[PDB]
Scaffold this active site. Structure first.
Site, PDB file in Angstrom:
ATOM      1  CE  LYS A  12      50.812 -48.820  11.921  1.00 12.19           C
ATOM      2  NZ  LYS A  12      50.521 -49.206  10.514  1.00 12.19           N
ATOM      3  CD  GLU A  17      56.382 -37.357   3.681  1.00 14.03           C
ATOM      4  OE1 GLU A  17      56.110 -36.331   3.038  1.00 14.03           O
ATOM      5  OE2 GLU A  17      56.689 -38.435   3.112  1.00 14.03           O
ATOM      6  CG  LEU A  18      52.875 -34.652  10.716  1.00 17.29           C
ATOM      7  CD1 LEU A  18      52.080 -35.731  11.443  1.00 17.29           C
ATOM      8  CD2 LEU A  18      53.238 -33.493  11.643  1.00 17.29           C
ATOM      9  CG  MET A  19      51.805 -38.164   5.386  1.00 19.56           C
ATOM     10  SD  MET A  19      52.553 -37.287   4.000  1.00 19.56           S
ATOM     11  CE  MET A  19      51.326 -37.590   2.701  1.00 19.56           C
ATOM     12  CG  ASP A  37      45.020 -52.884   1.349  1.00 19.99           C
ATOM     13  OD1 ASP A  37      43.807 -52.796   1.021  1.00 19.99           O
ATOM     14  OD2 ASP A  37      45.399 -52.879   2.546  1.00 19.99           O
ATOM     15  NE  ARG A  83      40.922 -49.983   3.388  1.00 19.91           N
ATOM     16  CZ  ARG A  83      40.326 -50.363   2.253  1.00 19.91           C
ATOM     17  NH1 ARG A  83      39.414 -49.594   1.682  1.00 19.91           N
ATOM     18  NH2 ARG A  83      40.636 -51.518   1.682  1.00 19.91           N
ATOM     19  CG  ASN A  84      45.099 -48.558   2.635  1.00 25.25           C
ATOM     20  OD1 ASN A  84      44.905 -48.436   3.842  1.00 25.25           O
ATOM     21  ND2 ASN A  84      44.715 -49.635   1.946  1.00 25.25           N
ATOM     22  CG  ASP A 115      48.410 -49.394   5.650  1.00 23.21           C
ATOM     23  OD1 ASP A 115      48.692 -49.247   6.854  1.00 23.21           O
ATOM     24  OD2 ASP A 115      48.009 -50.476   5.170  1.00 23.21           O
TER      25      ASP A 115
END
Length: 292
Positions: free
Chosen positions: A47, A94-96, A146, A150-151, A167
């Protein structure tokens, strides 16, 4: 130099694990990138902070790093470290590979070309995964503010995928056209009061998102329409083909008074009961019509 406290412990920028910029290579865009950190380098998500950002954006980026770095749970995305001493600044996660859950559900809907792409157990497993992360937050007195499809992120698209909370922007808490009203309980949008029972409500909305296979909550309603609807006792109908037992978790999550909503231990218990019930898990998901 803001302090951050989680689970009774205080950390600062100095506690973040700085990874030398020379060990980080960007591979592709996913802003967020796929990267590698150094025969088998570690695959990561990167990010980035835009170099043309405000000072608040800088502080917010730091705080994001502090927050994620202090969690330790298998259903919360790991922070590998940061690269804050070179520009643009990086947070390494971490790659998701499965991407976000909302996009996954929409793209992986059963269609004639893929008639058995998902089943009810896939959905219940995603629900269990996120409830597990939520229980960890609840036990550690962290209010997410939240929770939404989407998160959440998936480790991979295929079988064996694990869902994780990815997120931590706390978007519902103004302490607005960007406010996620469709995930908020009454006390949150009326009084700005947040507790773990406000996360329970939002989890109910996520469960609807999951069992609808990625629809926007409150079909055809605007934010203000939803606000007035929910305030007056209105609730969503079951998603298409949703088993009764699963809908009843949603409606318990949406009790008007926070004290009447289940905590995450009870949510997990109920999800497990659904997962055991053959009539639930043998229910076919709707097929969205398309070509072969």
């Amino acid at each position: 130099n803001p302090n951050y406290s989680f689970a009774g412990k205080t950390s600062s920028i100095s506690d973040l694990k700085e990874v030398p910029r020379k060990n980080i290579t960007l591979i592709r865009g996913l802003e967020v990138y796929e990267g590698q950190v150094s025969p088998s380098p570690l695959q990561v998500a990167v990010k980035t902070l835009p170099e043309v950002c405000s000072e608040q954006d800088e502080l917010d980026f730091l705080m994001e790093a502090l927050i994620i770095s202090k969690f330790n749970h298998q259903n919360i995305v790991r922070c590998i470290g940061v690269s804050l001493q070179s520009l643009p600044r990086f947070i390494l996660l971490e790659l998701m590979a499965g991407g976000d859950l909302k996009s996954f559900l929409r793209e992986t809907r059963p269609r004639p070309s893929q008639p058995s792409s998902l089943a009810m157990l896939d959905l219940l497993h995603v629900a269990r995964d996120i409830a597990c992360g939520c229980q960890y937050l609840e036990e550690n007195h962290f209010i997410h503010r939240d929770i939404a499809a989407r998160n959440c992120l998936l480790t991979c698209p295929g079988p064996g995928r694990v869902a994780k909370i990815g997120d931590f922007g706390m978007a519902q808490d103004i302490y607005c056209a960007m406010l996620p009203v469709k995930w908020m309980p009454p006390e949150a949008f009326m009084e700005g009061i947040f507790t773990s029972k406000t996360d329970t409500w939002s989890f109910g909305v996520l469960l609807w998102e999951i069992f609808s296979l990625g629809y926007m909550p409150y079909p055809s309603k605007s934010n203000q329409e939803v606000l007035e609807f929910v305030t007056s006792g209105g609730r969503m109908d079951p998603p298409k083909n949703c088993p009764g037992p699963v809908y009843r978790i949603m409606t318990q999550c949406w009790q008007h008074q926070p004290e009447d909503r289940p905590n995450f231990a009870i949510i997990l218990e109920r999800i497990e009961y659904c997962t055991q019930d053959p009539d639930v898990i043998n229910t076919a998901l709707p097929i969205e019509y398309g070509p072969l």
